[PDB]
Design a protein around this ligand. Structure first.
Ligand SMILES: Nc1ncnc2c1ncn2[C@@H]1O[C@H](COP(=O)(O)OP(=O)(O)O)[C@@H](O)[C@H]1O
Ligand SMILES: CC(=O)N1N=C(c2ccccc2Cl)C[C@H]1c1cccc(O)c1
Ligand SMILES: [Mg+2]
Length: 330
């Protein structure tokens, strides 16, 4: 039930000049990814896997958005909660997929930058959709990040990243939590997005000077909530509330990452149909439990490297993401 997809990144400059031989092969049509475990294109053994969708190195941000993100966003507009995880070793594309980058030399405005990822495209589209038709709506974003089991708010511009938020159980709706003091920044229009994203970027920079390998060891949860009061061409009015969570997990390669360890153990119990699911054993799984066997539509995008040097890690990632497919929620 949970939809899982694989994105393989292309070789980098340094890999090209070294005559890199990709040990990975993608077949979008057949929804298959193949990896050369033994070695040698003349003769070799390989490992094969099937997923809901597969994307090779030739895949651009726009293909990713039109294919996975557009449909899930439409659901969010309908009043549903959706989450999308990015999983994989550091250097494979988790941040590139989730956030995106800027093209060199100020070649494009942020809303037309082909290298832009899911977050900016989504915030830009929400306004692109609801504005067109007749819909009164409010957009609020939030960026919660977990490092060594401590919560941080990377969007609040009146407190630095030394102040870790506190987390409690929500007495109202069970299996839900309350993060004290987390900031919800309202986005009044498309032309207010970039700066808010710039804000988080800069705080993210101070977090990195303060915490070791911060960009590799932390989990970021960027949430976008949409309050809608749609008024049909007739005169009806729908009050819908949709929430989309975009998670850039900490690098899966292998001190300890309690949330990462716990996430793996939660998937295990969900697919093994084990009664006790260890949600409470980490901050991430308590924050996102409804995304794991709950009433939320969730998608996992596992990013892999083509380089033969990451064969062992490419296998763990694929194997890890293939098991997730058996998870059922809603
Ligand atoms: N699909 C892709 N297309 C072009 N470049 C990519 C792609 N995926 C990753 N890269 C490049 O690979 C490097 C790894 O980036 P990053 O997204 O930060 O990895 P991660 O988040 O998995 O640690 C970056 O320099 C990035 O520009
Ligand atoms: C380069 C930059 O400052 N960006 N910063 C981003 C960002 C930072 C924090 C939280 C969420 C996002 Cl997503 C992403 C990105 C971006 C935004 C818009 C268009 C792009 O091409 C890249
Ligand atoms: Mg990264």
């Amino acid at each position: 039930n949970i939809q899982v997809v694989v994105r393989c990144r292309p070789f980098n400059l340094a890999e090209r000049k070294a005559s890199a031989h990709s040990i990975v092969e993608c077949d979008p049509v057949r929804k298959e990814v193949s990896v050369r475990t033994g070695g040698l294109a003349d003769k070799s053994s390989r490992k094969t896997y099937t997923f809901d969708m597969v994307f090779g190195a030739s895949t651009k941000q726009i293909d990713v958005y039109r294919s996975v993100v557009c449909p899930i966003l439409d659901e969010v507009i309908m009043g549903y909660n959706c989450t999308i995880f990015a999983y994989g070793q550091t250097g494979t594309g988790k941040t590139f997929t989730m956030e995106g980058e800027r093209s060199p030399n100020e070649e494009y405005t942020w809303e037309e930058d082909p290298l832009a990822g899911i977050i900016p495209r989504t915030l830009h589209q929400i306004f692109e959709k609801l504005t067109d038709n007749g819909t009164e709506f409010s957009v609020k974003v939030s960026l919660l990040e977990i490092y060594n089991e401590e919560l941080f708010d990377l969007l609040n511009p009146s407190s630095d990243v030394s102040e870790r938020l506190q987390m409690f159980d929500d007495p109202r709706n069970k299996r839900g939590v309350i993060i004290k003091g987390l900031e919800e920044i309202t986005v009044h229009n498309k032309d207010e997005v970039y700066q808010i994203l710039e804000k988080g970027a800069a705080k993210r920079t101070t977090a990195a000077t303060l915490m070791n390998a911060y960009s590799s060891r932390s989990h970021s949860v960027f949430s976008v909530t949409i309050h809608m009061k749609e008024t049909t061409i007739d005169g009806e009015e729908l009050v819908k509330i949709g929430k989309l969570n975009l998670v850039d997990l900490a690098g899966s390669e292998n001190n300890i990452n309690q949330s990462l360890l716990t996430l793996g153990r939660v998937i295990t119990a969900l697919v093994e149909r084990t009664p006790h699911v260890p949600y409470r054993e980490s901050k991430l799984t308590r924050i996102l439990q409804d995304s794991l066997g709950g009433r939320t539509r969730t998608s996992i995008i596992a990013t892999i490297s083509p380089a033969s040097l990451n064969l062992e890690e490419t296998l763990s990632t694929l194997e890890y993401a293939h098991r997730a497919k058996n998870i059922l929620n809603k």
